Design a protein around this nucleic acid. Structure first.
Lengths: 426, 71, 71, 426
DNA sequence: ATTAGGTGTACTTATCTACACTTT
DNA sequence: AAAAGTGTAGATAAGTACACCTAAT
């Protein structure tokens, strides 16, 4: 049994049955009346099924070899969810802390970090990759993107301990020009007026890293605290296992290609009903899809889209993990979520989009409007983004040139057939 | 602002404010709600409309409306 | 019993119940509300109608409808 | 200064300024939030004007020489409102008791009444002659229909003292065959399905009297208490002086015939807005008017129509004081409230009713319906009412025969021209 | 140069005033 | 001897969509 602490307040209890190997969640009546559930699949009345609770908890864990690091510190079995969540319970995705009864370390301290300590990990002692090689074959999402969640006051980075938690996520690059890619993409998103997490490039030694501001975390100047806001990804919202993050959950094999049990665009838009403002949500989701289509992000999947949980309803979070995959040909280029049963970005035409919107029960002109708006604004936008960059070498410059060219190419390509969309017969 | 009982106009105003709260274009919100923006304009201004329309936009924007001895 | 969230139908039902609560015939209530009883029947059954009608009947019968981070 | 007590609870204070000769009413915050005002013209915030308060208080007093009786027991001047209300405060129209601070006499007991005590009052004074006042009166303010408000448990009558109050009104007849008239009229009302107070004929010695059940008062069997419910007449609702009870408040003089400052049907229906259910109220009022027209009641006036006061809004009371004036030719036969500027019942035709409904902004077919329904139902109804009568002599029988004949005559007369109404050009 | 708007046919629909119907 | 709740029909009137164009900032 573990107590659920939100901030300084206890919202309920998570009980685990060792013999039955089953999970249960029960909430305080105060929270039942005034509060909100962990996810839609774990209601306040305590009717949450063991399965949904388990999957929810699993979805909080790392999806990469980094997990195997948790096995390095932990002395339990891979099949043990409880101990793992108990280990990382104090700081995880979302605002929920899982605290053993009568255990609190309020008075703890900060652990300032000097650049050498950060650089020390890039040498990959006590850290992934090891084992620097993707993939078996065609990647992705692991393990080539080493990351560290840290507390950032605007000056110095430090490790969060006890009640304190990391306010930022620092992403270090090994694979070529990834920080620049995500930086340009995220800034491009923000410039276009999209709702997106704030990103800044930070330097450690000769290495560049991407500092991302957590929107589910807010630091208070003038005192010692870190404010958390609870969130859930689309897998946790739809009650899907982490394996279902991709629409095709059994892999890219052309044998299983026809089997999609995972998160799709329909399943995503279905969540608009649970949002405080369904229209706005669908708008955000559609712009997310179109944006990922234009920036050539094929890795946009279930856990890359999340919602703020509130008593009134769900709210969409700012976008995050926006990257152009089209740049890298050593990765998988087929979309995580297909457009009207088409996973090939190059096979997308007026038909796929027309049927895609028809499949959502939404007017096509909405997509025409939303698509035409962005693609036309990108050329002037991408320019402003490049100027936000720090000093570069020639390779990086060539990469950014290639990026700009590819982006403009996609923009033109899409902008080419948009008019056909209205008159298509699906 | 009115916590008072709603009429044809104040409903349109409520809708308009909830729309503007979401920073949504009339065309976009209308399209998503399954109506033309002109109709949405009619609704926002309190002009006469089919109840279905009103409920389409209301349900769209997630607005909930509810019905409000001896001595 | 009263369901809080209103839809097109439950509104008509609410109206019908409030009407029958006053023990008024459809023709009389409709006439007094300034509509034909057929229209009132349309409203009671939750069928599509002009919002003005709904508000005529609602205002007539004294039914009031109202708009309902961090850590 | 007098405290306002509703039941066992103090709802506020009525303050009187002796020097300024002005009235003021202020309420407790509990009552302000959860309660309701004395009338619409005396709001809970205490903004009620001295004028409206005065008129309201005056409206509670007797309109007949009985006023001079309360002056006989109290011994004060006519121009004194405070002392009179202070005198009768314990029992008045409505549920409001006006109690001097920290003063209660009664230790309430019952004072049983034997018929002899009644006959003593039916006998000379005990002043109720009351003619000839002044003045040769006409309209039913004339002479005396002596009544006493008394407690009736269903068996024995007793005087109400202290917190206890009269649950019934016993009306004794002097003028010929009035009890039978009001009985038949009220019972006819009740039979037709109208909302009306319940009446029963009671006998004292050889004298007949009409026992009327107060709808603003309810007795609890099994215990000693009397529950009051606050009400207001249309004069108190519209904030009019007692003099305005009749549409023509300056009398029937042909000089003042064109001057009507008093309660009319329009002014009455205007109150439908303040009711919890305006439609039902308008229905009640319309049926009231039509019923009074069919039964030939020309004395139906402002103080003969009242409303229950509740926090949610006003509600119409059951009808009362329904009498057929057409039977008596020694009285004023012109309506208290005119039909489209026509005070003569004999001059009422399709035109007057058409314009009457047009003046209310209501469909004519409504009046056609309500009129046609009743006028055909009266013939079968009046029969059933006669069977409710006690044993009669020949005079009474002749009176009831005349009554029935007149009633049927009116019914036919109205039913004659009712159809023309739709095609009338006003 | 974008959002909140007014146009324009062609279309679909609610409203009204009676009559007549199926059940008390 | 109905009453209240239904539908029917022509006739009036009015909403919706669909896309083009306006006026400002």
């Amino acid at each position: 049994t573990l107590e659920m602490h939100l901030g300084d307040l206890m919202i309920g209890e998570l009980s685990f049955d060792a013999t039955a190997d089953t999970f249960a969640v029960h909430y305080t009546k105060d929270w039942q009346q005034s509060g909100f559930p962990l996810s839609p699949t774990i209601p306040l009345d305590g009717t949450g099924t063991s399965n949904q609770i388990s999957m929810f908890l699993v979805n909080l864990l790392p999806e990469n070899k980094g997990l195997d690091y948790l096995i390095e510190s932990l002395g339990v079995s891979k099949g043990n969810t409880f101990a793992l969540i108990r280990a990382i319970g104090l700081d995880t995705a979302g605002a929920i802390a899982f605290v053993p009864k009568g255990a609190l370390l309020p008075e703890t301290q900060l652990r300032p970090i000097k650049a050498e300590e950060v650089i020390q990990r890039i040498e990959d002692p006590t850290m992934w990759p090891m084992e620097i090689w993707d993939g078996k074959p065609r990647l992705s999402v692991a393990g080539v993107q080493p990351k560290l969640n840290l507390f950032y006051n605007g000056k110095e980075f430090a490790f969060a301990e006890g009640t304190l938690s990391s306010t930022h996520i620092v992403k270090f690059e090994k694979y070529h020009h990834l920080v620049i890619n995500e930086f340009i993409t995220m800034r491009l998103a923000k410039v276009l007026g999209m709702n997106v997490a704030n990103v800044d490039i930070v330097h450690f030694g000769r290495y560049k890293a991407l500092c991302v501001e957590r929107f589910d975390r807010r630091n208070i100047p003038g005192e010692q605290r870190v404010l958390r806001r609870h969130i859930v990804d689309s897998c946790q919202a739809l009650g899907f296992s982490v394996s279902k993050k991709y629409e095709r959950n059994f892999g890219t094999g052309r044998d299983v290609k026809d089997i999609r049990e995972g998160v799709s665009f329909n399943r995503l838009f279905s969540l608009a009903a649970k949002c405080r403002n369904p229209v706005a949500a669908k708008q955000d989701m559609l712009q997310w899809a179109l944006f990922n289509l234009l920036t050539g992000n094929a890795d946009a999947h279930g856990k890359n889209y999340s919602f703020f949980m509130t008593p009134s309803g769900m709210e969409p979070t700012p976008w995050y993990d926006l990257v152009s995959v089209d740049m890298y040909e050593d990765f998988e280029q087929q979309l995580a979520m297909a457009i009207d049963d088409e996973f090939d970005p190059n096979s997308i035409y007026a038909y796929q989009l027309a049927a895609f919107m028809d499949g959502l029960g939404l007017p096509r002109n909405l997509l025409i409007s939303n698509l035409t708006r962005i693609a036309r604004r990108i050329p002037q936008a991408i320019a402003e983004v490049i100027l936000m960059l720090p000093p570069l070498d020639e390779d990086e410059a060539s990469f950014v040139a290639h990026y700009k060219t590819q982006l403009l190419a996609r923009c033109e390509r899409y902008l080419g057939f948009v008019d056909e969309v209205r008159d298509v017969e699906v | 602002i009115m916590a008072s009982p709603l009429n044809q106009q104040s409903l349109g105003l409520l809708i308009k404010e909830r729309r503007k709260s979401a920073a949504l274009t009339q065309d976009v919100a209308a399209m998503l709600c399954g109506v033309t923006k002109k109709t949405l304009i009619r609704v926002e201004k309190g002009e006469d409309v089919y109840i279905s329309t009103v409920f389409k936009i209301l349900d769209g924007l997630g607005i909930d409306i509810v019905s409000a001895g001896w001595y």
